[PDB]
Every structure is written in C-alpha cells, then in structure tokens.
Amino acid sequence: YDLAVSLCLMAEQTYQYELNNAAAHFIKPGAWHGTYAGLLAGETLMLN
Amino acid sequence: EGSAGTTLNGLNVEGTQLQASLKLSDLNIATDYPDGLGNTRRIKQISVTLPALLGPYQDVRAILSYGGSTMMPRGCKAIAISHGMNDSGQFQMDFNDAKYLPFEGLPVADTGTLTLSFPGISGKQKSLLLSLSDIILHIRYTIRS
Amino acid sequence: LAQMEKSYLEKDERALEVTRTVSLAEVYAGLTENSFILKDKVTELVNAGEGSAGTTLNGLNVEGTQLQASLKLSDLNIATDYPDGLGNTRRIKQISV
Amino acid sequence: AKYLPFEGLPVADTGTLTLSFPGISGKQKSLLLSLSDIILHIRYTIRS
Q: Which chain B residues have any C-beta within 8 angstroms of a chain C C-beta?
C-alpha cells in the first residue's frame, strides 16, 4: 500500500506538472482504514 | 578576466570558464502572439546553434543551464552542447518522448536565468571562442489554453 | 520488485549526453613518453610487420599478422572535460569509430 | 531495449581500449598504409 500510494502521488505530481495546476488534488488522504485492515484501499486508489 | 553587460544578461568569465547569460523575462516571448490563443505558454525544448569554425573532428563543450526556482522535474535543467549545430544534449532528438525533454515545462515568461557556459576559455577552446560569431538559441515552446 | 521499481523511478533522472571525438594522432603525438606521429609509424610497422610504437597500453603493436592500436581511458581525462558540479557518474553510452 | 556496446563503461577507468586490425600483410596492407588516423566518437552520459 505504501508503494502503490507512492506511485499514485507520483502520477499526481506529473499531472500537476503537465496541466499547469499545482492545486490539483485527486488522491485523498485516507484509503487505509486501519480498523478494517486497510481493505478496499486499491478500490479507492483506482477511483482516484 | 573581464565581463560584459549587466548581471543576468551579459558575459562573465569565472576562472577558466566563460559563461553567457540571459533572462527569459527580457525576451518577451509571451507577447509574440496575441493572448487570445492561450495563456499557459511553456517551453517544450531548447536547442543551441554555435556557428563557429569548427576544426576537423573538433568537439564543442558548452552547458546551457537554467538558474531559477521552477521545478523542472530532474536533470532536464541543463544540456551539454557537443555538436554545436542545432542540438540539444540528446542523441537522436525525440519529440513525443516518454520522458520529459530538457527544459520542458519552463514557463516562457519567468524571471529565470538561462546561462550558457564554456569550459576551458584559455586551454583547448580558445580558438573556438575566438571564432564564435554568435550564440543562437532555438526556443521551442507550446501555447496552450 | 515494486520496491525496486519505486527506487528506480525515484532515482532515474534525465542525462547529460556528451559525444567526445578522440583522434589517436593527437593522443600518440602528445603522450610525452615514446610519443610518435601515427601516419609514419603505421607504415613503418606495416611495411615491416614486426615492430611496436609508444609505451604499453598507449601505443601500437604488431602481433603476428595483426596490428593493434591501444589506448588507456584514464590517460584521456574525459571526466574533467566538464565541471564536477553536474554529476560524478560519467559512464560511456556508446563508442563509434 | 538491449545494452549498446561499451554502455556503462566508466569513462575514467584504468582500462585498455584496443583497436586491432586482422591481416596486416595480406588483404589489408594498402588500407593500413593509407590510414590517416583513427578517430573514436566516445559518447557518454554525465549523471548525478
């Protein structure tokens, strides 16, 4: 999960670089809900 | 030893290294075309032409760097000029590359410094710099709305 | 594999591609230890297929029916052509003759 | 996709770069007698 959310924020960073918009925020803080073992993390990240 | 012009738009010798400088805000590239066709005017690619009397099988050594605060993802901030005749640093120039070209995404009207520096002013490249007519920059940019 | 791919994507940067033209006449002429001119030592070693030229590892040598011309890359000082502030890993991409 | 020849050679190593000609006295005597010089285009990459 740490690796793939790093890849997601990497793609978000190049989105902010190409479209000249440094405030574009598609990958929300969350998606690892610790009480349900971080399940549905990849569903939330595919949504983003 | 000497220098020429003002700071950030002139020549300067630093030790054994001549550099020629430029400010992109002082070129007014953002007002070459009318503003009705887009405001995000960002550099795609920059290539350098040095019309000098290159000897038989003689190399060029020059680094065109950027001095400023723009992001410029990684080592795309500088190129090395070896051909001297309409080159970037790259071997086989490739627009629509998967990776970012050097200086790609530079906002063409920023208050940055575009410095081209020559190694070896008095050593192996005295004759090249004495025969240098001018320095020519092909600034390729993109006007996007 | 994903840790290694992440480290690759975080550590891969662009380049500084430099071509450097090396002529062996300039290297053999400015070698300061058994230095020689190339065009006459090649005809000396080809019209008599025995001799050598220069020092070892930076000179000519005929071995049987095979002339070889040698070079040491540490003796070219390619790593100090550009200033060291632009990177230290300076590795050959390609060599053409 | 594959590595070019001599790719990744550290340009300041203490290695030997030898160019060797087959047939000094046979089919390639005239070529070596007419040889002006040997020119090497060493293409390298400066990376931080």
A: 17, 57-59, 61, 63, 74-76, 78-80, 82-83, 89-91, 99-100, 102, 119
Query: Cα D31 from chain centroid?
Result: 17
DSSP B79-125: EEESS-SSB-S-SS--TT-SSPPTTTTEETT-S-EEEEEEE-TTTTT
The answer to whether the CB of B139 falls within 8 A of the CB of B37 is no
Give, in order, the Cα–Cα distances in Å from A45 to each of A14, A16, A28, A42, D4.
Answer: 16, 17, 9, 5, 38
Given resolution (angstroms): 2.8
Q: Which DSSP category does B23 fall into?
A: B
Q: How far is CA B133 from the centre of its chain?
A: 16
Which of B43, B71, B74 should one mutate to test binding to chain A, selecting the residue with the greatest count of A CBs within 10 A? B71
Minimum-distance CB partner of B57 among D39, D43, D48:
D39
HSE on the CB side for A7, CA within 13 Å? 13
Q: What was the structure determination method? A: cryo-EM
Query: C21: which residues sit within 8 A by CB, 6+ positions away?
Result: B57, B58, B59, D39, D40, D41, D42
Contact D45, C90 (CB under 8 A): yes
Region at C93 (left for phi over 0; alpha for psi -120 to 50; beta for the rest)? alpha
CB B24 within 8 A of CB B108: yes
Name the residue of chain C whose CA is nearest to A11's CA: C9
Asked if B75's CB is within 8 angstroms of C15's CB, the reply is: yes
Interface contacts B/D by beta carbons within 8 Å: 5
| C94: chain B residues, CB-CB within 8 Å | 91
